[model samples]
Target chain A: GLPRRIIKETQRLLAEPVPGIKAEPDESNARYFHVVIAGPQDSPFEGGTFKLELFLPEEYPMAAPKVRFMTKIYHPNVDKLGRICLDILKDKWSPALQIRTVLLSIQALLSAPNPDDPLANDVAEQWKTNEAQAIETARAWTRLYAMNNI
Target chain B: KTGLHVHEKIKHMVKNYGTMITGIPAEILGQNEAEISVGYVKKMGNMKENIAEVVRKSEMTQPTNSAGKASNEVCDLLLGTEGASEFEKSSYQVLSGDGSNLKGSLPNKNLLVRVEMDRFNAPQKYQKIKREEFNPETAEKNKIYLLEDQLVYLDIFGKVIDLGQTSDTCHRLFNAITTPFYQNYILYDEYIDPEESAEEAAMFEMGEIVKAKMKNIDCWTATHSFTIFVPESDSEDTRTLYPYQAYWTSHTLQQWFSGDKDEKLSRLGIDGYIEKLALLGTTTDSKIRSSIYGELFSPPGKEHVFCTGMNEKFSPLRVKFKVTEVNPEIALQNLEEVQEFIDTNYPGENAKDQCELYKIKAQEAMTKQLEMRLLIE
Candidate 1:
């Protein structure tokens, strides 16, 4: 039942033309959905695309779906293992969450990223001290790990 | 006879007698309390001019047979009454086969002053046949502690486990630590996509549940709970007004388990004693094949005893992978080689064990944990 519902939702999202950030379903299975968002022009994460994956859970809405980074994007809040450092993913999560709201939240997070809590420790520290260097490093990582796809 | 003065024969004899023993030293048995003196008067030099006066103050010390008495006395005072007989005991009498008579009849003089050849050199073989008997060392009187302890048939755990209500809290604690955790924490994350219809994104999956069951992991992953009960403030001598409380979750138990050795229970809080224990444990740890010596050793104290519990899945947490096993193989091959190995490997390590106290803590921890687990689960 979950697999069928996940596939149906995935097809419906891709069929309709959407604006804001680019989103795509996994080539192999509909369960894994990948999304990529172009960084804000004035933000430290400019000139790069941040990629993320949504792993559908059995009890959707009852239990939140698991979301993590799929692309090797560079940011103070993105770990080497592509784990996204976000507060909503932790304590603030509720069963009332939906896919549209989460994607919008991701776009908002890109505009104003939190450098205090970071998945990439050194990058976060550098971001706090030197924003210009952090931006350059993130752009360079986007070119290298993200394959200039943004 | 290196031309010792007539009055100095007592000191010379005592000194020479101590040196004659194989392992005994002269300085150890040269105390004036056990020195012998019985020579004639002499006016030459600074010698005793009055033989009668010298005889009156005669310091006839006990010979090799009784020299061990001084050591025994010290051992008794320091190591309690039961530990007094750490030395071997025997007697030597100076006697001659030649029958010669002199003034005041031969038997009376012989009874009072028996002078004979070396009777101690080839005395009859004496064997100690008593259990826990205190034997005296005839050689060094002052070197009382140089006595050998009895060879006990100690098993791997050392000492028999008697049936009764002993403070086996340590064993219990050890069991709790060794047992694996049964439950795994469930982690869930959520996601949302932009431009997606609210109805499409509303309810996705619900059929199959993603199951994650934990098997036997490293036992060290379990949390450590300590209970400290503070005495009442109104008590005559309260230890502390408030009891301290804390917990160490999923810490390495190896640090505690391999701390001290089997002999450390007796040397608790002694200066340099822990160092000695560590050294011994390191020495043995490098050579012995016992489970106790296989890991990093921990030191025990009154409040707590440390030990390790391995995760069944992780290689590092496994007790079978302990480094202490190599210590025994090297030690058994050659002592000098083992010493070198210990020096190289353990370095400043020592062997200390709170056998008694730890046994109590480990058992208590196990009992409490088991009782709680049974009640709850």
Candidate 2:
């Protein structure tokens, strides 16, 4: 059975939609959800819509949901498999935190990239040594791969 | 002398496997005729509290006899890749075997006992050591097995020697004497309530809205009552009110009533607004409280927030009365029983309201009855 907290969160999300993000639960798997995140303004990913998959395991609330970007992108903190190296998504996760808060954090992360703490070391190095080139590459990748209207 | 032998065996084990062998019985090497040697002990985290211990050598006069063959197989099963790496690295193995562990261990006998069944009453079954090797599948399903106490070892003169009442004593004798190399597995199993079954997805409620079986609690239905959010948009300023945000405001007030601040701000905005609203039945404050009230209630124009007893669109504010399940008789047994009885018999929107009103009254009755019972007791 799905936990009471999950149902409440799901209902609230639908009733009170977040500004630029939309999430829908899978028909078959109540635990699986498909999400679309509109890139934050004033960032290389601005105007792009990123697709991601989220899954709630049996131990959710106690354990953070598994989320990964399905769309390709060029970011130092995001690895090849779209694995995000974010503290709150992992060891820093608290049961009090919920999916809405998590999505907001991810959106905030899109606006503020941290090259110093990078998942893709090479991309991080590019960002650190030559920021303009790295940002340009990220913009181009977003336009090409994310299929955003430039 | 037997104690000395046992001590020597323990010393060998400590040297080989390290001091983590605290739980294993070291006394399994008591007085016996045959010489014993220890094998590698495998420890895997997934096994929890369980571990695998192998017996390598048990030299009896008949070196190539059935006993010797059993010892080798037991050792191979435990020490080799088959037993050591089969299951996920859990803490321990269960007691007794259904031919698999023995076929997997090296062998089993009175000299060595399956540790789980010995110490804990693990329901693991085991085959007799005398059984001839057969198909693994067929061997487990139809084979007759014996308990730990059924087997006994023979001394050099051919007289039967009782290995002792418990497996711990038997293990010491077997290790000290000539016994097949056997492995002992210990596992950690946790308990959970059987009644805690999974329930399907259900709609969320604001505490006062609860589920109850009507038939079980008389024919009463609970009423859903709460402050409705009234959305206001000021034509003067362009602020559009959201139901969710208003819902949060109402939620915030409930928390404040219970002496809690849902969010941390430099000063109390919602809290102050609520205090003022209480004083003036219809209200506002100029500072953070006024701004918050304007955002949550006023809605922009020449805003005047008023309370309406009737349900209206955008009045999403509410303080819920607690709803609890109670007996039908209790609900039917209320001060307005005659009115409720007539209303209930009428059967319509009025009937529904009557049922709901009866339910709340019944809940109140139940609470008072409980308090009375407690005081009387």
Candidate 3:
């Protein structure tokens, strides 16, 4: 009934945190996790650390995961609240798994945003037409909200 | 005229002369190969999986009575003549690691499925059932398959060691899929999780262990093993569905009649055919639930007739869960409404058990949510 597959992988996550990202399962429920991702270097979000939450239903692998960003990040895909436009998250399905890869894929997304399949409609607008200021706002949002550690 | 003298008169006429026009009802139905001029015949070899191909394919393969099929074609294919063709028989083989491999000596050669449950670590607590049947939807009729299947029942697992198989041993798990039933699969679960090939794999838990024990049965050949699943904790739903086990039935005529009643089937003219034949909705899913037994986990092509839990790393018999955008909330709600509707409109104790699928649906939904949470967490 319980996959219990995450025991070793999650425990191992402590020592070798997924590069460019950090994930920790909830103390109350192993099914809910807290994540912290380092904004990709060279992107406008550099030096930013974002908070996210992921919940696995009983049907993980059998069912895809439930992951959502808790910390508001500015990006074309990361919308007002935090519904990313990654197909793998929504209508998209299936494996190529292990938590490490999952964490890394989002990191790659942060590095390369797809204004083409934009989640933040407003964000994608400036992204295509007024490209310079779009990058500017991307940097300023990261500066004000994400890079908070003194 | 319905059920009146006029109705009786027509029935007598169709009874007396119906065969003349119905064209040998027994042969048309018995062979499932209909031939009424161009009325509707089976596919010629030139067929390419189109509607022309499917209608006959659906009829030829869909089981007769939901109560269960008595003839047992796959057995003849398995033990009698051709010897359960590896591809056609669809029987699962049980292999062992912690223990030695088991053998099933068949008055009819048999096999088993080893089940494990609860806190999975090797085969801890599991039951078995023999599952040797094919899906009309998935099976290629050009090949022979056991048309009917026999079920071996087991009581819920517990402290007692009184292990036994029941039935005069004549429990019939019938095939009752219809054009509508297969249509539902193609329309519903398939798009959500196309890989499931669910039209074939209805339910199968641990099977090999049951087949090995089936060797104990000397009278009738044991073909089904407990594809029976162990409970997360014994719940009424688990108890009900687990025992009913894996099988498919299409006898929902009561509901069929219940719906838009006079509007539909009469328009198609098959209402009498269905009512007279009792071809749909006789029993639930137990008597050789052909729909679930064969083509489980893996589709028709991928399953290994001689292997367990691994054919190229994963057993086709493994219960596959897929992620979908469709909301389970909506699904649960739909089950709720449907069950409610059945209770209200199609009210009957049998109708309730038919609706009791609420139990199974909720249980799987719960497991789905749990499994999904496990992955994300």
Candidate 4:
């Protein structure tokens, strides 16, 4: 069984509202969630907000909950498989990992996806072969898809 | 070292054939006694953690033993003008051999979809590395063959997908079944001949490709598994690439829920829309189906989107109660209101629940797939 604190922490995040996250309802369940984090300034993801799904596993803290991309994103740490390459999610996972920290890690991934390793091959490819074009493409996507059609 | 020998061989052979090979600088590695050499096209991105490696080498032999004979046939096909027969021959042989690198570099031992198993027929269908390249029809056929095989055998964890379909087509079907949400990851095995690497024969090596899949499909069949091989065994060498598709998919789900500008469709109550479709059993409609395609996110509006399949027959009408647009409390209130609207306004017992159900089922299926019991942290 998981520690009650972890479970309680998950519930707290599920119940509270985040500042920048703009997402739809969990059509299926309440515990599971879909969240959007707009890319921070100065990063290629600037003006772009990426999407992600967070689930609280039955075994919290002791085990990491599954996180994945619900929308298409360009990043080196993320592979074509929709697997995130975050250090906390991998080697640094700890029982102390809370929803805020987890989401923060995701935000970091968006702002700076390590092209040295990537999930979206074409995105990573473009990122490497032509940074200008890749950045342009990302900006275009941000304007076209992530900008709320504004 | 394997590199030293392979280089000596290529130089001598190229001189003997009076043909030169060159192009885009990619790391090349020819390891051990194997005739296979790994190639990574510089422009083709997506190499995370050495998981995906391309083995590019001539299959033609030295005119001595069986391996030699196989290699010779491969060389003939690679240099031949017929079709992609040469590419297939090389791919098949490398995958067919006893896997000499069982314990060494190649960690995908005991993996499925090796070059040996005849999951693909019609050698003449290959377009890139054929013996005689005159017949375009044969090349087209080969393209279809290669495309179909990759889809059929695409590793999806443990999901049992029909091997007769192309990855795109199968994924399209799943996308339709669970609208607004889907198995949003795809890894296509592209065939290409690099213009830069002139040292290796101008045979088609696996190029970088991106596609989508349904998360509802089993984990064993997940195609996210790939092994890469770059030159010098130092600047580039991958054992197994970690699956980043799931992480990206999660992000896509969040974006869709928030309704980003590029994905108005996703914002159009996509999860709810799909849930309703599944309820109505309109999972096979062509127009509705096209809207959920992963490729739909490619280029110009390149968005990474995803969904999962649902059993529309007897699943719960309302699986989760979390809200998307406004807030959980608001979402719950709106759902109740919508439920009442359907109850009184339209009473056919089929008040367009499929669209809503499709979303629910898709999420459930996705949860099943994403419940990776082996997360590191």
DockQ of the candidate models in sequence: 0.01, 0.01, 0.01, 0.01
What fraction of the native interface does candidate 4 get right in terms of contacts? 0.00
Better of 1 and 2 by TM-score: 2
lDDT by residue for model 3 (B1-377), tens: 11122222222222222112111222234222322212322233433222232232222222232211211221121123243133223533333321122211111111212221111111112211224432334432111111224333222222122224333221221232222223111111212222343323321211232334433422122232222111122333221111111122222212221232223223322223222212111223332223223323222232232122111121112121111111223323433443355355334455335333333333333333333333431
Considering the two chains of model 2, state its CAPRI-style docking category.
incorrect
Stretches of candidate 4 off by over 4 Å are A1-3, A10-19, A22-30, A118-120, B1-377
The C-alpha RMSD of each candidate to the native structure, in angstroms, is 34.5, 35.8, 26.9, 31.1
Give each candidate's interface RMSD in Å: 32.5, 22.8, 19.4, 22.0
Candidate 1 on B163-222: residue-level lDDT in tens?
A: 122234323322222212101111122333312533222111100111111112111221
For candidate 4, lDDT tens digit of each residue in B160-211? 2334445565343332322111111111211112453331111222212111
Tell me the TM-score that candidate 4 gets on chain A alone. Answer: 0.73
Worst lDDT run of 10 residues, candidate 3 chain B, spans B315-324
lDDT of 2 by residue, A33-53 (tens): 888988778989987889988
| Backbone atom clashes (below 3 Å) for every candidate | 56, 39, 52, 142
Candidate 1 chain A worst ten-residue window by lDDT: A112-121
- Binned by DockQ into CAPRI classes (incorrect, acceptable, medium, high), candidate 4 is incorrect
For residues B57-112, could you state the per-residue lDDT of candidate 2 as single tens digits? Answer: 11111112122222222222223324323321333232121223222332111111
Estimate TM-scores for all models.
0.28, 0.30, 0.31, 0.29
- Provide the lDDT at A72 for model 3: 69
**What's the true lDDT of residue A106 in model 1?**
67
Mind listing the fnat for each candidate? 0.00, 0.00, 0.00, 0.00
